[PDB]
Amino acid sequence: MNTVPFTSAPIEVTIGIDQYSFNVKENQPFHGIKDIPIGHVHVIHFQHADNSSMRYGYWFDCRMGNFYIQYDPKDGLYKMMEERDGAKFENIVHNFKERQMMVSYPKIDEDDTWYNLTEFVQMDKIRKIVRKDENQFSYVDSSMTTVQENELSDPAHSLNYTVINFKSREAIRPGHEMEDFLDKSYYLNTVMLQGIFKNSSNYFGELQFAFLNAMFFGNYGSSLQWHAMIELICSSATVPKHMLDKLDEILYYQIKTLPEQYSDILLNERVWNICLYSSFQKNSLHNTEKIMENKYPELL
Amino acid sequence: GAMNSSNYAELFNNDIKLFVDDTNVYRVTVHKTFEGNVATKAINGCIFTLNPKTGHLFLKIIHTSVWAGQKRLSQLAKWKTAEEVSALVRSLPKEEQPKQIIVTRKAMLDPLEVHMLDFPNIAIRPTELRLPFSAAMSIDKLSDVVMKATEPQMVLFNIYDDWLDRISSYTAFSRLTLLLRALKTNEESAKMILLSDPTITIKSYHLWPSFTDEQWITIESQMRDLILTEYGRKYNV
Numbered sequence: 001m002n003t004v005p006f007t008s009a010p011i012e013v014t015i016g017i018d019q020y021s022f023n024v025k026e027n028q029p030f031h032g033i034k035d036i037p038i039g040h041v042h043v044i045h046f047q048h049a050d051n052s053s054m055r056y057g058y059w060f061d062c063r064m065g066n067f068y069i070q071y072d073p074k075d076g077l078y079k080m081m082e083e084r085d086g087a088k089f090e091n092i093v094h095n096f097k098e099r100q101m102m103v104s105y106p107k108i109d110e111d112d113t114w115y116n117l118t119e120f121v122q123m124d125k126i127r128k129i130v131r132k133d134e135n136q137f138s139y140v141d142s143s144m145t146t147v148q149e150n151e152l153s154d155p156a157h158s159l160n161y162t163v164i165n166f167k168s169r170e171a172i173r174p175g176h177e178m179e180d181f182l183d184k185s186y187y188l189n190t191v192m193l194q195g196i197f198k199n200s201s202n203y204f205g206e207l208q209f210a211f212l213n214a215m216f217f218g219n220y221g222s223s224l225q226w227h228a229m230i231e232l233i234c235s236s237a238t239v240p241k242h243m244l245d246k247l248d249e250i251l252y253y254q255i256k257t258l259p260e261q262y263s264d265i266l267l268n269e270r271v272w273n274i275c276l277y278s279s280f281q282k283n284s285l286h287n288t289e290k291i292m293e294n295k296y297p298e299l300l
Numbered sequence: 301g302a303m304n305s306s307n308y309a310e311l312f313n314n315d316i317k318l319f320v321d322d323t324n325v326y327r328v329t330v331h332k333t334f335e336g337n338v339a340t341k342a343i344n345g346c347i348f349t350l351n352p353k354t355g356h357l358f359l360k361i362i363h364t365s366v367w368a369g370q371k372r373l374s375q376l377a378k379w380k381t382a383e384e385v386s387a388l389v390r391s392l393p394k395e396e397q398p399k400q401i402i403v404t405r406k407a408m409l410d411p412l413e414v415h416m417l418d419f420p421n422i423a424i425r426p427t428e429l430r431l432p433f434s435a436a437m438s439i440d441k442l443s444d445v446v447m448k449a450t451e452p453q454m455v456l457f458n459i460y461d462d463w464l465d466r467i468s469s470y471t472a473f474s475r476l477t478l479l480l481r482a483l484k485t486n487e488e489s490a491k492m493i494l495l496s497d498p499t500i501t502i503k504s505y506h507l508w509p510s511f512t513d514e515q516w517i518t519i520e521s522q523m524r525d526l527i528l529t530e531y532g533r534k535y536n537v
């Protein structure tokens with residue numbers, strides 16, 4: 001179990017750690033988060049009490065280094081940093097724990113939610129979508145745009161998700177125009193899975209990362225990406241059986257975890273009604289269809 | 301964006317454009333089978349691809365053999381239309397290729413867009429106009445070549461005859477949509493007015509009678525009366 005200490009909390013802020021969150025008052029004696037489960041990526045995220053504009057946060061994996069948070073009064077945000085002095089860090093953390101100034105990552109033992117949401121998400125793949133190679137952790141916020149969004153303006157601060165576009169030469173084989181547009185299996189299996197992602201685990205990892213950035217930061221380009229990757233599978237007549245079974249599980253836990261009050265902006269009606277009711281895979285997402293129908297029948 | 305009443309003069313500027321109408325591509329008669337079920341029998345169709353500025357009409361004849369053994373024909377017909385329009389553009393010299401293709405039905409947008417991916421600079425546009433091009437098979441010289449076809453074939457026409465020697469393309473297109481709207485609302489009575497005078501002949505190399513400017517302004521009025529009538533005869537007004 002690992003720890004992310006905070007130097008201090010000089011401004012009132014709601015702090016999230018994965019799906020949990022807590023309020024910290026201005027200059028409240030808060031020194032971090034302990035008992036973070038090893039084996040998963042994590043996200044620590046922030047919303048200032050004064051400026052609900054810009055949710056922002058940091059993807060990290062405590063196996064890759066010792067990380068801590070420190071407020072920067074010039075740039076006006078909580079920044080993640082790496083502590084390279086291992087003994088300084090252990091000593092800092094042990095003092096804060098002794099004084100009990102840390103919140104405990106509040107995982108219930110039966111609860112597999114975070115595993116289920118991050119099953120295929122790897123830090124190494126996050127760092128290729130979020131390019132900032134001098135850090136082991138990745139910053140994301142509500143306003144960052146995607147590479148594909150920039151094609152339709154600062155590249156260093158982009159989300160470099162795999163571009164999917166159903167009306168493109170990559171997606172459509174010359175002479176198979178109708179076949180490939182109505183049955184996207186070629187584009188899914190040959191172009192994306194065999195060509196770009198190499199396997200379905202990497203595909204699912206980007207899909208899950210896109211959902212999590214959409215949910216936690218309201219990142220609109222991430223929401224677009226999550227829906228496109230769903231739609232590309234459901235609009236393929238030919239999908240490995242193991243992928244369809246895993247997709248139903250993945251989406252089930254995403255819909256389960258989504259705040260009820262955010263469904264209006266975060267779920268695209270067309271994609272979901274097409275996927276659950278019109279597409280080739282309309283009959284292959286039983287768990288997802290049942291939770292959607294009991295939790296968001298309005299959308300459908 | 302969409303083509304409508306407000307940007308109507310754009311049709312007659314000097315940017316090459318084509319209208320594509322797919323209505324008459326997939327044509328069937330519906331009939332009873334010996335067992336009392338219903339079946340369709342396809343007949344020859346055509347793609348109606350028209351330059352509204354010049355009157356040049358590329359009439360691609362769709363022979364019934366193209367449907368043999370195929371499923372979901374109404375959907376295939378749209379993709380076949382797009383394939384044939386795309387092949388037509390590729391066959392034209394670059395300086396004759398259109399800068400816009402306007403489709404008369406919105407369901408043609410994605411099929412044409414996908415077939416024209418190689419031509420990213422050609423705009424594929426819908427329209428809000430209710431254009432009467434389905435009535436092109438009322439013209440016996442066009443209907444006759446479609447029905448006689450024994451294989452796929454492209455036949456080139458000028459749908460304005462020699463009108464552009466005397467009128468503008470705006471006026472010519474207005475006359476055409478008036479002749480066609482009248483043929484589409486009441487084919488018989490329109491023909492009986494159009495051919496009322498048997499001394500006014502349809503030349504061998506023309507589709508319409510050899511009307512002078514004074515009959516042409518008139519008959520347009522007769523194209524008006526019929527359409528308002530049928531609109532009363534329909535709504536009772």
Ligand SMILES: O=C(NO)[C@]12CC[C@H](CC1)C2
Pocket residue numbers: 438439440441442491494495502507508509
């Ligand atoms: O059939 C025709 N030409 O081939 C006509 C010409 C005027 C009437 C309307 C269309 C008859």
